[PDB]
Enzyme design. Structure first.
Site, PDB file in Angstrom:
ATOM      1  CG  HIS A 173      72.697  72.243  33.139  1.00 16.40           C
ATOM      2  ND1 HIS A 173      73.359  71.059  32.909  1.00 16.40           N
ATOM      3  CD2 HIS A 173      72.622  72.878  31.947  1.00 16.40           C
ATOM      4  CE1 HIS A 173      73.681  70.994  31.623  1.00 16.40           C
ATOM      5  NE2 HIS A 173      73.246  72.086  31.024  1.00 16.40           N
ATOM      6  CG  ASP A 182      75.199  70.461  28.304  1.00 21.57           C
ATOM      7  OD1 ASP A 182      73.959  70.629  28.540  1.00 21.57           O
ATOM      8  OD2 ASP A 182      76.011  71.408  28.433  1.00 21.57           O
ATOM      9  CG  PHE A 240      66.013  74.068  27.464  1.00 22.86           C
ATOM     10  CD1 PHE A 240      65.456  73.812  26.209  1.00 22.86           C
ATOM     11  CD2 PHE A 240      66.954  73.171  27.989  1.00 22.86           C
ATOM     12  CE1 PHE A 240      65.828  72.702  25.467  1.00 22.86           C
ATOM     13  CE2 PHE A 240      67.351  72.073  27.254  1.00 22.86           C
ATOM     14  CZ  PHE A 240      66.794  71.835  25.974  1.00 22.86           C
ATOM     15  CG  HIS A 283      69.528  69.612  29.467  1.00 18.97           C
ATOM     16  ND1 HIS A 283      69.082  70.769  30.070  1.00 18.97           N
ATOM     17  CD2 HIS A 283      70.737  69.911  28.918  1.00 18.97           C
ATOM     18  CE1 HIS A 283      69.932  71.749  29.788  1.00 18.97           C
ATOM     19  NE2 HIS A 283      70.971  71.244  29.146  1.00 18.97           N
TER      20      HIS A 283
HETATM   21  N1  HCG Z   1      71.797  72.108  17.268  1.00 15.84           N
HETATM   22  C1  HCG Z   1      73.023  71.971  18.088  1.00 15.84           C
HETATM   23  C2  HCG Z   1      72.799  71.273  19.425  1.00 15.84           C
HETATM   24  C3  HCG Z   1      71.859  72.113  20.316  1.00 15.84           C
HETATM   25  C4  HCG Z   1      71.637  71.348  21.622  1.00 15.84           C
HETATM   26  C5  HCG Z   1      70.678  72.012  22.577  1.00 15.84           C
HETATM   27  O1  HCG Z   1      69.509  72.151  22.260  1.00 15.84           O
HETATM   28  N2  HCG Z   1      71.107  72.425  23.747  1.00 15.84           N
HETATM   29  C6  HCG Z   1      70.039  72.893  24.663  1.00 15.84           C
HETATM   30  C7  HCG Z   1      70.632  72.383  26.033  1.00 15.84           C
HETATM   31  S1  HCG Z   1      72.509  72.534  26.286  1.00 15.84           S
HETATM   32  C8  HCG Z   1      69.982  74.420  24.859  1.00 15.84           C
HETATM   33  O2  HCG Z   1      71.176  74.793  24.910  1.00 15.84           O
HETATM   34  N3  HCG Z   1      68.705  74.902  25.482  1.00 15.84           N
HETATM   35  C9  HCG Z   1      68.794  76.153  26.073  1.00 15.84           C
HETATM   36  C10 HCG Z   1      69.665  76.856  26.788  1.00 15.84           C
HETATM   37  O3  HCG Z   1      69.581  78.053  27.213  1.00 15.84           O
HETATM   38  O4  HCG Z   1      70.550  76.166  27.011  1.00 15.84           O
HETATM   39  C11 HCG Z   1      74.123  71.416  17.172  1.00 15.84           C
HETATM   40  O5  HCG Z   1      73.580  70.601  16.148  1.00 15.84           O
HETATM   41  O6  HCG Z   1      75.142  70.699  17.774  1.00 15.84           O
HETATM   42 FE   FE2 Z   2      72.844  72.468  28.758  1.00 16.70          FE
END
Ligand code: HCG
Ligand code: FE2
Length: 329
Positions: free
Chosen positions: A268, A214, A209, A212
Site C-alpha cells: 500500500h 508494513d 508516502f 511498501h
Molecule cells: N517508528 C515506528 C515505526 C514507524 C514505521 C513507519 O514509518 N511506518 C510508515 C509506513 S506503515 C508510515 O506509517 N508512513 C506513513 C503513513 O501515513 O503511513 C516504531 O519505532 O515502531
Molecule cells: Fe503501512
C-alpha cells in the site's frame, strides 16, 4: 477512475468472549479478507476512537517548536543518541509536511532488563512536560493498553483463521516485553502546499508516502475520515475507503514470512491530500526473542522452506530498510 478496494467490515466482538463457534466465524472472515485484498475494518472493537482523536489533536496542536527539539529523535537531534524510535519526528516547513510522535511499551522503564542490557529497539519513552500537556502521558499510556487489548483479540482471530489454537500468536505478545509501538502522525493542511513534500508515483498519483509492506506482525490503524490509502491488487491500486469509527487492519511482512505468503503483507501507499488529518497506527510487534516456526496452511503437512527469524532481528533490520527505501519520517 480508481476503483474501490474490497475492505469488509468485520464485527470482532466475539474475539473478546468465550463463544468458540462465533470466534471461528469471525476467523473465517479474517481468513477471507487476508487472502483477498489483505485489508478489513474491525468494528465493535470497544475503543473510544473519538476520544483518541480528540486527545491527539489537543497534543499535536499545542506542542511548540521548543518542545519538539527537546523530545526529538536522534535523526533530528544528535544529542539524543538513545532515541532511535521513541520521541518526536519533526516536519521541515517547505520540504516535509508530516510530523509525528512515537512511543513504545510503557513497561520499558529504566529498571527493565532489556533497557539495562541496552538491547536494540528497546527504549524508555520520552514525554512532554505534564503541566504543558496535562493528562497526555496517562491518556497515551492507557491507549497503548486499550489497543494492546484489541490486538490480542485480533491475534486470536488470525490464529484460529490459520488452523491454530487461539493463543498461537498471542502467547508471544505480552505486556512485559512487546516491541509494539504507537505513532501519532499529523498530516497538515498547508497553503501553499510545498511540492518538495509531494512525491509522484510511477502512475502519476501524488503521494505523501510511497509503496511498501508494513514492518509488523499486523497493523491496527485509526485514521481520520479523509480518504488517502491505496492497496495494490491484481487489478492495480485501489482506494481504501476511510472509516473513522473502525480500525483498519492488515498484515505485515512478518505474518507473510510465517505463513509462507498465505497471508500476504499487502503493498500500500499514502496519497497526497491537502487536509489536516491523523494517522494513528499501532504496530503489533512481538518480543525481541520471539520466534514462531514458519508453516504453510496450503501444504498437507504444513511445512515451509522458510527459516525461523527472531522478531527482534526482523524489526531492527525492517525499520532501517523502510527508512532507506521510503525516507526518514
Ligand atoms: N517508528 C515506528 C515505526 C514507524 C514505521 C513507519 O514509518 N511506518 C510508515 C509506513 S506503515 C508510515 O506509517 N508512513 C506513513 C503513513 O501515513 O503511513 C516504531 O519505532 O515502531
Ligand atoms: Fe503501512
Amino acid at each position: 477512475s480508481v476503483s474501490k478496494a474490497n475492505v469488509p467490515k468485520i464485527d470482532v466482538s466475539p474475539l473478546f468472549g468465550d463463544d468458540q463457534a462465533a470466534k471461528m466465524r469471525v476467523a473465517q472472515q479474517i481468513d477471507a479478507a487476508s487472502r483477498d485484498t489483505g485489508f478489513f475494518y474491525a468494528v465493535n472493537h470497544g475503543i473510544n476512537v473519538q476520544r483518541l482523536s480528540q486527545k491527539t489533536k489537543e497534543f499535536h496542536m499545542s506542542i511548540t517548536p521548543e518542545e519538539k527539539w527537546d523530545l526529538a529523535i536522534r535523526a533530528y537531534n544528535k544529542e539524543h543518541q538513545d532515541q532511535v524510535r521513541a520521541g518526536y519526528y519533526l516536519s521541515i516547513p517547505g520540504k516535509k509536511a508530516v510530523e509525528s510522535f512515537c512511543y513504545l511499551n510503557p513497561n520499558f522503564t529504566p529498571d527493565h532488563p532489556r533497557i539495562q542490557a541496552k538491547t536494540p529497539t528497546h527504549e524508555v519513552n520520552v514525554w512532554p512536560d505534564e503541566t504543558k500537556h496535562p493528562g497526555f502521558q496517562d491518556f497515551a499510556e492507557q491507549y497503548y493498553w486499550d489497543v494492546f487489548g484489541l490486538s490480542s483479540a485480533l491475534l486470536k482471530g488470525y490464529a484460529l483463521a490459520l488452523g491454530k489454537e487461539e493463543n498461537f500468536f498471542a502467547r508471544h505478545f505480552k505486556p512485559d516485553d512487546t516491541l509494539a509501538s504507537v505513532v501519532l502522525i499529523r498530516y497538515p493542511y498547508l497553503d501553499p502546499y510545498p511540492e518538495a513534500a509531494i512525491k509522484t508515483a510511477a502512475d502519476g498519483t501524488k503521494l505523501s508516502f510511497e509503496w511498501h509492506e508494513d514492518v509488523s506482525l499486523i497493523t491496527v490503524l485509526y485514521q481520520s475520515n479523509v480518504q488517502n490509502l491505496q492497496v495494490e491488487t491484481a487489478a492495480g491500486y485501489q482506494d481504501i475507503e476511510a472509516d473513522d469509527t473502525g480500525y483498519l487492519i492488515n498484515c505485515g511482512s512478518y505474518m507473510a514470512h510465517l505463513t509462507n505468503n498465505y497471508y500476504k503483507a499487502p503493498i500500500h501507499r499514502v496519497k497526497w491530500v491537502n487536509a489536516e488529518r491523523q494517522s494513528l497506527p499501532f504496530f503489533v510487534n512481538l518480543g525481541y526473542d520471539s520466534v514462531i516456526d514458519p508453516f504453510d496452511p496450503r501444504e498437507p503437512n504444513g511445512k515451509s522452506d522458510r527459516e525461523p527469524l527472531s522478531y527482534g532481528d526482523y524489526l531492527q533490520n525492517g525499520l532501517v530498510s523502510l527508512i532507506n527505501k521510503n525516507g526518514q519520517t
